[PDB]
Ligand binder design. Structure first.
Ligand SMILES: O=C1C[C@@H](c2ccc(O)cc2)Oc2cc(O)cc(O)c21
Ligand SMILES: O=C1C[C@@H](c2ccc(O)cc2)Oc2cc(O)cc(O)c21
Lengths: 387, 387
């Protein structure tokens, strides 16, 4: 009796991305003048050697601009947030408990418009953030804001970190594939108001975060068995993995304290990622008979430019493989979990714009990586869609 | 090519619970004398009217004892935690970032021993807590503590709230069912060090939390296609749902602030649950042709005794239906997400101990409910196993 229920309950094909929408806070922060702005707003103009260090960090970040909820006015009303270490979580929480779901909503509405189907067909909702926590969570808030059905099945992924654009895909794949008819709204929404803080010359790792992290949200619609010519596949998920790199204990740690979310880097992240990326690739692609890593399309969490450069150098990727990734890093900076989803959007839009044969730059198979605390590597194997 | 991959990648039968293990902090706190202890340790002996109110809350809680990581000594070294509202998150975080995964480990080792199979066959790990956040999260910590493989696929469920014993089952069901061979370690671990606080007479809702919440962890092994006579099914999952009750906005809210996690109750939770439980039952059981709610076995998150009493009254459940639920509330109090998992354990142990025909009290079909912020109701339909 259960066998019949099970066979009738499950979906049949591969989880597919059917729509992608993004959004960012309206405030555009140029990187070229950021060092001058940041050192003034944090009352750190006298830390001249540190300021020079920050300028080099920003000049080498390969980020031209970021979008930030935080403004000069907001920072002027919250001096505790402008300090390196002052009690400020309640202020930060008040910002991000509202801004996460607000920005998420903006991205989600865009994806839902693109998908074109009734929002009442959304059966599952995954919400992911590294920016603040609350109960009921941002999943409840987004259900209310969007007018989803009350019986949507929710998955609130809090305090996840930069690899979770990969984690939400891994999770959505099982939801979509094991449930016939299921349509999963996937929302990653990240707001750096929880992490912004002043500079300290004995905490340079912390300072790196201030050059790289930016805000944004991305939303997907994921489902199996798309309805031919009503729904429009963009990418298909085939296989996923998550692993912890050896010798990386404590590489990237973030603690949520009374002073907000702190960021620490205790190990060479570019070097750990580059030494371990090959093994992740062979686990994913050896069973598909593929070993030429220029023959697949690429999406890599741009944690900083050095991760990308060292990965490219390790594997001998052509410089063009990382173009969509670098274009997102350039235009938005490191938006933690949302970044990889912006990169998927950029890639399928550019491929479609330029008349390529597939959404994956004209290539069939592709890989998406997320990198973050653990040190964790998330791998998602994708297949593109014709046109 | 993808069709063949998909067909080979997926599991075939219903996600099944194969092992359950629990653990609690060693410190046993009697409820009968708790009012006297709590009012002394929080320097509130002069709040005589409030103290009488607390005594009635404890006397009516139907809780005989709870296990708490927090001790008199710990509370004496942290007066900020003993206040109703003082900056104390960093202290609390330091406790629960270590205690969550420590207690989780204890429960998990027990489940893994019961299951009897190599820990290297664990492919997925779900960790759930309402107690503190960190990056890398408690999932990374438990991977390290248990010696799981680095490539275990992790799902870190933070700041979830009391319904998430249901959420982790809903999630594990899709993971197990969509992936052939997948074995999911599921760990809920809750520690009230983030929520303990002194009494305030204008915040009675907060005070209710101090009478009811207790600590504990429970771990499961979940998988499809159990290996006959090597693995031993206990319960099978068949169908799940999650919904938001109408007219319940703001019923149960928890904010993570500089003063720790605060708890608020703005609406009648027993009354919202009781008015909406029937609809959840008909959605789950009408398609199975079942309408006699005494004919199924029951597991209900014991948020407080009044939820149980009003549900029992609404449906005309026999008083015995809630015995396993009430026995867990009596012996451990409200352990947020872990509670329902302790109740499954208690039920299958009592059924097996007493020579019943099934693990679900001799009955075939059963329901598990989790209730919490939103107001959210999670429903999990279970089938028991012979013997
Ligand atoms: O400190 C932070 C900030 C967070 C973030 C980035 C972008 C933004 O918009 C929201 C917050 O990302 C992170 C990701 C981690 O691996 C490590 C961390 O410590 C953090
Ligand atoms: O404030 C808390 C504490 C948390 C909890 C309970 C037991 C324990 O061991 C760990 C923490 O449970 C909750 C569940 C919620 O719906 C609402 C909340 O605000 C909270």
């Amino acid at each position: 009796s259960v066998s019949e229920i099970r066979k009738a309950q499950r979906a049949e094909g591969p989880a597919t991305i059917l729509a992608i929408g993004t959004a960012n806070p309206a405030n555009c922060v140029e990187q070229s003048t950021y060092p001058d702005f940041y050192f003034k707003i944090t009352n750190s103009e006298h830390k001249t050697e540190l300021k020079e260090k920050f300028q080099r960090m920003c000049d080498k970040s390969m980020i031209k601009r970021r979008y930030m909820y935080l403004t000069e006015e907001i920072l002027k009303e919250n001096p505790n947030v402008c300090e390196y270490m002052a009690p400020s979580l309640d202020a930060r929480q008040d910002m991000v408990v509202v801004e996460v779901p607000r920005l998420g909503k903006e991205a989600a509405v865009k994806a839902i418009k693109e998908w074109g189907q009734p929002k009442s067909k959304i059966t599952h909702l995954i919400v992911c953030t590294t920016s603040g926590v609350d109960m009921p969570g941002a999943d409840y808030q987004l259900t209310k804001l969007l007018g989803l059905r009350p019986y949507v099945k929710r998955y609130m992924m809090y305090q996840q970190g930069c690899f979770a654009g990969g984690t939400v895909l891994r999770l959505a794949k099982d939801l979509a594939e094991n449930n016939k008819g299921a349509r999963v709204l996937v929302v990653c929404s990240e707001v750096t108001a929880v992490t912004f803080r002043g500079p300290s010359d004995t905490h340079l790792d912390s300072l790196v975060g201030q050059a790289l992290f930016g805000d944004g949200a991305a939303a997907l619609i994921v489902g199996s068995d798309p309805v031919p010519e009503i729904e429009k596949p963009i990418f298909e998920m085939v296989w996923t993995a998550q692993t912890i790199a050896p010798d990386s204990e404590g590489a990237i740690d973030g603690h949520l304290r009374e002073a907000g979310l702190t960021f620490h880097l205790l190990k060479d992240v570019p070097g750990i990622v580059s030494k371990n990326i090959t093994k992740a690739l062979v686990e994913a692609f050896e069973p598909l008979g593929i070993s030429d890593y220029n023959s697949i399309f690429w999406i890599a969490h741009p944690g900083g430019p050095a991760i990308l450069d060292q990965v490219e150098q390790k594997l001998a990727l052509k410089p063009e493989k990382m173009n969509a990734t670098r274009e997102v890093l350039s235009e938005y900076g490191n938006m933690s979990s949302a970044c990889v989803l912006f990169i998927l959007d950029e890639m399928r839009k550019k491929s479609t714009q330029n008349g390529l044969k597939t959404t994956g730059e004209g290539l069939e198979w592709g890989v998406l990586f997320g990198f973050g605390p653990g040190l964790t590597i998330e791998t998602v194997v994708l297949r593109s869609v014709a046109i």
